[PDB]
Design a binder for this molecule. Structure first.
Ligand code: HEM
Length: 154
């Protein structure tokens, strides 16, 4: 798939707002993921012990990982489809070290859209959501192909 420039502009315009508060958005997104699909929490030996939303919100460690996640994702989106070099080391660790199935990437994709919609309604109308969805689908497609190359395709 290929996004048009107008679609990239919609994605990067809401992303610019997200970057006004990277830590807060990262926390919101990971907490939404873990609440909506608690099985994903099991992949994180680091966070496995967190029992309630309250404990999640109070974890400095979770907040630091959310910054790491959104910073990496941001770097990929700003490549506007030219993200081959960035995707390679990402795919290798998520496939053979952490073992993250494509299904879980769909789940975090859903969490990202939920948080953007909730915090940025005026810059995240139907057309901008459609563009963000297509960018994240482009990302999952490319990761699926890489997984396969790497011998995981999970
Ligand atoms: C937008 C999707 C995601 C991005 C951009 C992302 C990014 C990252 C980055 C940059 C790291 C640190 C370096 C590394 O280990 O490769 C990391 C670690 C990790 N990720 Fe992801 N990730 C994503 C989705 C997920 C999902 C869906 C899960 C699990 C359900 C996951 C599980 C992990 C684990 C277990 C670690 C190691 C945490 C630790 O330090 O103990 N990732 N991720």
């Amino acid at each position: 798939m290929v996004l048009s420039e107008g679609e990239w502009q919609l994605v990067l315009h809401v992303w610019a707002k997200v970057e006004a508060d990277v830590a807060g958005h990262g926390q919101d997104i990971l907490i939404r993921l873990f609440k909506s699909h608690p099985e994903t929490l099991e992949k994180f030996d680091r966070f496995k012990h967190l029992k309630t939303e309250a404990e999640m919100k109070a974890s400095e460690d979770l907040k630091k990982h959310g910054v790491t996640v959104l910073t990496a994702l941001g770097a990929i989106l700003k490549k506007k489809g030219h993200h081959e070099a960035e995707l390679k080391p990402w795919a290798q660790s998520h496939a053979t070290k952490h073992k993250i199935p494509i299904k879980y990437l769909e789940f975090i994709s859903e969490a990202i859209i939920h948080v953007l919609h909730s915090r940025h309604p005026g810059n995240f109308g139907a057309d901008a959501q459609g563009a963000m969805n297509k960018a994240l689908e482009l990302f999952r497609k490319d990761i699926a192909a890489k997984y396969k190359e790497l011998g995981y395709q999970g």
